[PDB]
Amino acid sequence: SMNPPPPETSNPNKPKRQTNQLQYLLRVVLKTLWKHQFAWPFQQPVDAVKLNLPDYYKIIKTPMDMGTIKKRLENNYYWNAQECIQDFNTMFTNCYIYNKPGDDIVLMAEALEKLFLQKINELPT
Numbered sequence: 574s575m576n577p578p579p580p581e582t583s584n585p586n587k588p589k590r591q592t593n594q595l596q597y598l599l600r601v602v603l604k605t606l607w608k609h610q611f612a613w614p615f616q617q618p619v620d621a622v623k624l625n626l627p628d629y630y631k632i633i634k635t636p637m638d639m640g641t642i643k644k645r646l647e648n649n650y651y652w653n654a655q656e657c658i659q660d661f662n663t664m665f666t667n668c669y670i671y672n673k674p675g676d677d678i679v680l681m682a683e684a685l686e687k688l689f690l691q692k693i694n695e696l697p698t
């Protein structure tokens with residue numbers, strides 16, 4: 574297939590709030606991962622046309638990426654911190670599902686996930 578539309582990044586019907594946890598997710602967690610050397614491939618949706626991955630969306634029905642997460646945080650899409658944590662987890666898990674233990678992109682995902690866990694460890698109460 575071609576690519577689906579990217580995940581929604583705004584919901585005008587959903588109320589908005591900026592909590593200490595959401596602040597930390599944007600200013601610390603997302604910022605740290607985004608600026609990591611390995612971030613580029615995760616900064617926008619998987620492009621199955623450009624990467625020549627005809628079966629990507631047969632396998633991955635819940636795509637996610639850090640570009641989407643960034644936009645969601647910057648747009649105040651998330652009401653609960655858990656929504657954002659779940660998106661990071663989906664992004665990493667999809668990479669492990671589609672690819673193989675040896676692969677460069679998997680090594681990159683694992684490094685980013687470790688960093689994610691180190692940062693989320695200090696998520697405020």
Ligand SMILES: COc1cc(C(=O)N2CCC(N3CCN(C)CC3)CC2)ccc1Nc1ncc2c(n1)N(C)c1ccccc1C(=O)N2C
Binds near residue numbers: 614615618619626671
């Ligand atoms: C802006 O998005 C991307 C840019 C590039 C890219 O042009 N370069 C330039 C060449 C560069 N190399 C130069 C040669 N060197 C030895 C290694 C580094 C690596 C980065 C490469 C990949 C990009 N995007 C990308 N999105 C989602 C994917 C994914 N890739 N990978 C690699 C996957 C590959 C196959 C199947 C799935 C994925 C995947 O799960 N993710 C998350």
Ligand SMILES: [Cl-]
Binds near residue numbers: 577579618619
């Ligand atoms: Cl997309």
Ligand SMILES: [Cl-]
Binds near residue numbers: 574630631
């Ligand atoms: Cl399909």
